[PDB]
Automatic annotation (TrEMBL):
Binding site for Zn(2+): 271, 273, 282
Residues represented out of the complete protein: 1732 to 2193 of 2193
Gene source species: Human enterovirus 71 (EV71)
Protein task: Protein 2B: Plays an essential role in the virus replication cycle by acting as a viroporin. Creates a pore in the host reticulum endoplasmic and as a consequence releases Ca2+ in the cytoplasm of infected cell. In turn, high levels of cytoplasmic calcium may trigger membrane trafficking and transport of viral ER-associated proteins to viroplasms, sites of viral genome replication.
Binding locations of Mg(2+) 2: 233, 329-330
Subunit architecture: Interacts with capsid protein VP0 and capsid protein VP1 to form heterotrimeric protomers. Five protomers subsequently associate to form pentamers which serve as building blocks for the capsid. Interacts with capsid protein VP4 in the mature capsid. Interacts with protein 2C; this interaction may be important for virion morphogenesis.
Family: Belongs to the picornaviruses polyprotein family.
Ranges for domain RdRp catalytic: 227-342
Domain of life where this protein originates: Viruses
The protein's name: Genome polyprotein
Binding residues for Mg(2+) 1: 233-234, 329
Positions with a binding annotation for CTP: 174, 236-238, 289, 298, 360
Native organism taxonomy: Viruses, Riboviria, Orthornavirae, Pisuviricota, Pisoniviricetes
Subcellular compartments: Host cytoplasmic vesicle membrane; Host nucleus; Virion
Length: 463
RNA sequence: AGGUCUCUCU
RNA sequence: AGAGAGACC
């Protein structure tokens, strides 16, 4: 991704997009009970903790673009993945606006508390005044579609969330690039059936884990991913995508039978305009963060990427022996023989991709079931039933979460959610967690799940 | 203040 | 179905 220009909103004629300036996160009653280093992300250029210019840091993620058109390896990768997708029989026909607005079995209805985007946010029109769940009304929608059209700018807001200390010093807050309601609708109409298919079929046919539930999906993954594992991390995956990967996405969509009218929506993703505060800017390459379908297209692109990297890096790769699942940039993959990611990362650099070892060290060490992580969780076989696999979230990350709150009124829900994550680490660690919670008066006031009930509820998911 | 999953409350 | 929360990407 690369920013092509920046202009004042007077010159472009766009309405200003202002976002909140102060965090909703304050220390919780557990802030001193548990260790942690994270704090709310810098949200304002005048944050005292900054040690860099804020807006420079905000847009450094756009590292540039290298390739613009597919080479042989990317072509073969794209075609191999699309062929794999054929066995899913995706309905490449346009989904209805009513289905696209109000939802189906495998596609959530448009969230009515998520923003409407440009220009609706600026001119006060609310999503509640245009869509009605009881009515399944597309009347006003069709109007505002005709009124404001498509290819509207994405509205840029900084994300209010915890971040590590180095990321606060360095200004590295994350951005939400919220699509406009009209483009959500058009994208959900064009690809909603594909979204349905992916959501219902997390695994190694889609190559996607969007829609997975880790409590149950973890037990499938060692069977879906036989052989030797490989994985690695990206730095700034979304922002580092060169336009070649959106060309490659077009290859995939066409080969599984999408119309050229549908395939043509991809250039509107590759080339996007954003309003942040009082400025407009153009972005060439790079996936927009808050687009309808961001995770699914990131995940498909990743399937193209891993295949290409394999067949360009090594001789004799049989892509039919690759197994992988991606959630956006996060990837876990396997192959009958070990894969050297040091060499994959070298090839990745040529494509404009920055790939680093999965263990966060400087060396690409072996990835096995005992150290692999996906969606930040490890893999722990149950002591009683070793075919059942616990997704294990590090207590360190749960410790960081519980030290802060956005509304202390829901302390109960917050602690319960963390408990549903924490018990997978075992009885002793869980009871150490609960004891620490209860060492504090608000802690003795909470209904806290008992470990044996958690375990039994999880076992029952498999019967 | 984008999605996915999970939980909670009418 | 209506309101909320948390985690992850
Ligand atoms: Zn432009």
């Amino acid at each position: 991704g690369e920013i092509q220009w920046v202009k004042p909103n007077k010159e472009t004629g766009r309405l200003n997009i202002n976002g909140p300036t102060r965090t909703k996160l304050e220390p919780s009653v557990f802030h001193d009970v548990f260790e942690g280093n994270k704090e709310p992300a810098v949200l304002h250029s005048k944050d005292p903790r900054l040690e860099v210019d804020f807006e420079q840091a905000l847009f450094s993620k756009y590292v540039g673009n290298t390739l613009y058109e597919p080479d042989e390896y990317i072509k073969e990768a794209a075609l191999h993945y699309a062929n794999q997708l054929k066995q899913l029989d995706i309905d490449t026909s346009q989904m209805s606006m009513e289905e696209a607005c109000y939802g189906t079995e495998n596609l959530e209805a448009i969230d009515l508390h998520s923003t409407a985007g440009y220009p609706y946010s600026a001119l006060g029109i609310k999503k509640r005044d245009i869509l009605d769940s009881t009515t399944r009304d597309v009347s006003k929608m069709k109007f505002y579609m005709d009124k404001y059209g498509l290819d509207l700018p994405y509205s840029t807001y900084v994300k209010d969330e915890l971040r590590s200390i180095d990321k606060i010093k360095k200004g590295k807050s994350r951005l939400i690039e919220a699509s406009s309601l009209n483009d959500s609708v058009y994208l959900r109409m064009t690809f909603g059936h594909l979204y349905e298919t992916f959501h219902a079929n997390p695994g190694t046919v889609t190559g996607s884990a969007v829609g997975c539930n880790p409590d149950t999906f973890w037990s499938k993954l060692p069977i879906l991913l036989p052989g030797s594992l490989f994985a690695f991390d990206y730095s700034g995956y979304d922002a580092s995508l060169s336009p070649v990967w959106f060309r490659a996405l077009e290859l995939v969509l066409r080969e599984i039978g999408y119309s050229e009218e549908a395939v043509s929506l991809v250039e509107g993703i590759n080339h996007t305009h954003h309003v942040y505060r009082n400025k407009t800017y153009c972005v060439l390459g790079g996936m927009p963060s808050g687009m309808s379908g961001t995770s699914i297209f990131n995940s498909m692109i990743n399937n193209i990427i891993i295949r290409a990297l394999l067949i360009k890096t090594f001789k004799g790769i049989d892509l039919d022996e690759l197994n992988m699942v991606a959630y956006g940039d996060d990837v876990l993959a396997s192959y009958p023989f070990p894969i050297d990611c040091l060499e994959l990362a070298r090839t990745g650099k040529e494509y404009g991709l920055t790939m680093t070892p999965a263990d966060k060290s400087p060396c690409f060490n072996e990835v096995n079931w005992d150290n692999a992580t996906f969606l930040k969780r490890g893999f722990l076989p149950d002591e009683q039933f070793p075919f059942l696999i616990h997704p294990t979230m590090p207590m360190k990350e749960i410790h960081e979460s519980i030290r802060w709150t956005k509304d202390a009124r829901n302390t109960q829900d917050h602690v319960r959610s963390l408990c549903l994550l924490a018990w997978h680490n075992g009885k002793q660690e869980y009871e150490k967690f609960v004891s620490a919670i209860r060492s504090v008066p608000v802690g003795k006031a909470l209904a806290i799940p008992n470990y044996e009930n958690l375990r039994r509820n999880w076992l029952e998911l498999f019967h």
